[PDB]
Amino acid sequence: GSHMKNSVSVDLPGSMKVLVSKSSNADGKYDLIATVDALELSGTSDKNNGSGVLEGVKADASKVKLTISDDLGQTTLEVFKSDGSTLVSKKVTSNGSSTEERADGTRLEYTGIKSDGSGKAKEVLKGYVLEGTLTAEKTTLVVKEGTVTLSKNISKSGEVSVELNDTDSSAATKKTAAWNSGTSTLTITVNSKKTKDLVFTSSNTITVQQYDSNGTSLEGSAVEITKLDEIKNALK
């Protein structure tokens, strides 16, 4: 039915919004509501400006907690396991930057974020840092070697896919590659023979394995990459 608006919408960093109540309850508290990646979070605050803590629970039982700083300059979005204390992920966002920290210690860092949503991206992994760009569509981290560019894409849902392009002026030495989304594996081909598989693991590591001289089967064992140089060597 027709009704009084009992909340105001407040703008936060990273195009987030929070609804805060116009008046306080008997405990002196203002009600807060926000929708974050399709989950409605709710909380109460002793401030009237939109700052405070909101909580929600995902379908898989994980606990979500959003902390909005007093001056509205920063937001922290934590996801915990159903125990409410084992941290799965933490994303901290301000005007112009954001950092996502994973359970395994790796981070995605976004800086210089522009009015169109684009910016610089860095993925801090064990042993090395991958850099690239953020757009409103996705994050792309690149490694380059000669005329080859390897591109690791991360979708807005966190899904990883990889692609390779080679501007080599010689057809015979040009690298091409195909991605297998079921195995998160990139297979590189040169001169009509598969040469190596780059496996992007669930542990945020990469492994490399060579094919035999005929391109018909993998040989040896997969080697875990620990250095950026090893990725560049794979692209030679």
Residue 215: CB minimum distance to Mg ion, A: 16
Residue 209: CB minimum distance to Mg ion, A: 19
Residue 173 vs 176, nearer CB to Mg ion: 176
Interface positions, 81-140, toward Mg ion (CB under 5 A): none
Residue 176 vs 181, nearer CB to Mg ion: 176
Residue 180: CB minimum distance to Mg ion, A: 14
Name residue 181's beta-bridge partners.
none
Q: Which residues contact 27 (CB under 8 A, 6 or more apart)?
A: 44
Pairing between strand 185-190 and 175-180?
Answer: antiparallel
The answer to whether the Cα torsion of 81, 86, 88, 91 is positive or negative is positive
Residue 16 vs 190, nearer CB to Mg ion: 190
> Which residue of the chain is nearest Mg ion when measured via CB?
176
Residue 174: CB minimum distance to Mg ion, A: 9
Interface positions, 147-206, toward Mg ion (CB under 5 A): 176-177
C-alpha 69/C-alpha 229 separation (Å) is 41
Q: Which residues contact 187 (CB under 8 A, 6 or more apart)?
A: 177, 178, 180, 194, 196, 197, 198
Residue 79 vs 148, nearer CB to Mg ion: 148
Contacting residues toward Mg ion, per CB under 5 A: 176-177
